[model samples]
Target: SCILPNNNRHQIFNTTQGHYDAVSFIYIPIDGGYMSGSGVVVGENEILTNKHVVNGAKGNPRNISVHPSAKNENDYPNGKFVGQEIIPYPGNSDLAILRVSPNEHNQHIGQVVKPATISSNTDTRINENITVTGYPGDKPLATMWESVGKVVYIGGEELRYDLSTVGGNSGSPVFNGKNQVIGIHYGGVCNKYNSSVYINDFVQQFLRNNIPDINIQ
Candidate 1:
């Protein structure tokens, strides 16, 4: 029997491992400080996350940085990439595609860490097991964390799951049992069901057109 009213989240120390390597720690510099979030590598130089997370960087893409396999605030095992452009969804979806330019050495982040597999099919089965990997605001800074749960709802452009998450978890990739990304985690109340942007036709077409060398499942 499934336990009720319990947190199933845990920390991830081996951020450079498989699947985890595609996860990125996003940092957006504001006027005074910086806001943090999470994202996943979807292409050669592309990252997928919530639009709100990179909204502030609209004026200057350089205001944001993406760190893959980040262990902490001070450790970046996979190095980092500066934002070259931010493409928020044309409509009301809480999703965005970030294009990061290559480093000084002309090496892209995706070249170092692999990109996650995105599902082409939008229909995610109900009660299907899922995993969310990202950084939580309440947890230690930049430390990766993971939570697991089953999809409880999937009726619209979003999927509601019982994954434990917080503020910084926004933009986390929601992976199905087959390790294929089905959605982009956006928001939810703690201890309750969380929601993610369902990977629909629009999202798939958008990424396929924008991100180079992306293989959609």
Candidate 2:
């Protein structure tokens, strides 16, 4: 994990052209293997990601690390690593919010990136062009930052985006035209087309009820 500053303002604005950067770092340690996914900051020190990323190693105590920036993951001290604090699948739409404690020095080490705003209404339609940012596995060189993508479809809690994503991109944020958070990068059929799970009212309430008091600077 690395902590780098969000510098691609031009690219972020050009692609999504609507919201602030919605990026985050996710780390999961399993038995013989480890997995990482891109997450979106929805609140102070609170990240939105796929439940599967952290649920695969259920019953086993796993370490969760977050890098506020794109610097070397070793440089910053270990973030608030929770052990099995995720909601189960099916009922929660594969989404999970991780709570992290702020550094003692209030170090914004890039673990706590900018959180995009959420839309207030649900009357938005599909086919609306949106943007996505995540660390896809293909471009290992660009692991610290997020890439952009567009929306292809929108119906209920399912949304289709044309963003270039990979297996590691699960849990990224899908931003609407207004830069408001509307979806989470769950998974896709192929490496090219990406699919997302829309953040609906129920999901919002669920997050609020589950994880509370995230300390961010």
Candidate 3:
């Protein structure tokens, strides 16, 4: 299922709760353990993860849980949350939005679950420095970890990065210099490079109207 060889050089933090707390763990129970990845809060109740994260369990959302700032089990004070809906990118993309039910933690600040600042317009801003954070399992750590790098390339559907990352980083959120989300992390070629699904029109439109109150037009 991995695109490249197993590289454990990258760190996967299990304690990054306060800073970059918007990032969360997308965990799915499989084979008695958990198959995990990363994701970000894109709306009040919406999350964006790799298209494969939820589907990896055979399109079953019931077993999927989002652990916010999950440092061990303490960060998940609200416990694992169920996805109310899962809407995948209906195109040649590796990412999509998953909506969760309203919870007590999502409404509070400085909590495990939180909303992220997303770039409304990401038409340009290439070759700039940015940071990416996620909870990885390849080389698990105590807290979530971050890898910073400059955007190497941007396409209508993808963006490349020179950031240091490894397996278990898929579905991570790609943030800009301003800490605004610009893309969704997905693939990598090991030591060579990694790529993400750049934020585009379809993404913006989908996130904006993903709330429960809004009608899916």
TM-score for all predictions? 0.93, 0.71, 0.80
TM-score leaderboard ranking: 1, 3, 2
For 1-217, candidate 2 gives per-residue lDDT tens digits of 1111212211221222223334655666777986777766566556677877666556443376554332234432234334334443345476776655565567432244445566643755655666666655554422443445456676567777665556666787776666677778787665345677776666666655654532221
- Model 3 C-alpha lDDT per residue in residues 124-188, reported as the tens digit of each score: 46778876778666544324667767778887878777777655677888887666788889986
Better model by lDDT: candidate 1 vs candidate 3: 1
Which numbered prediction scores highest in TM-score against the true structure?
A: 1
Give the distance in Å from residue 214's predicted Cα in candidate 3 to where it truly belongs. 10
CA RMSD, predictions in order: 2.9, 6.7, 4.6
Candidate 1 local lDDT, 1-217, one digit each (tens): 1112645888888898888899999988877887999999988899999988998676688988899889998889978899998887776789999999997789998898888999875457889888888888888889998888888888667888876787888899998877888999998655467888988887777777787698798
Residue 65 lDDT (model 2): 58
Looking at candidate 2, what is the lDDT of residue 41?
58
Alpha carbon RMSD to native, model 1: 2.9
Locate the minimum summed-lDDT window of 10 residues in model 2. 1-10
- How many clashes does the backbone of model 3 have? 7
Clashing residue pairs in candidate 1 (N, C-alpha, C atoms within 3 angstroms): none
What TM-score does candidate 3 reach?
A: 0.80
Pairs with steric clashes in candidate 3: 13-143, 13-144, 14-142, 14-143, 15-142, 15-143, 16-144
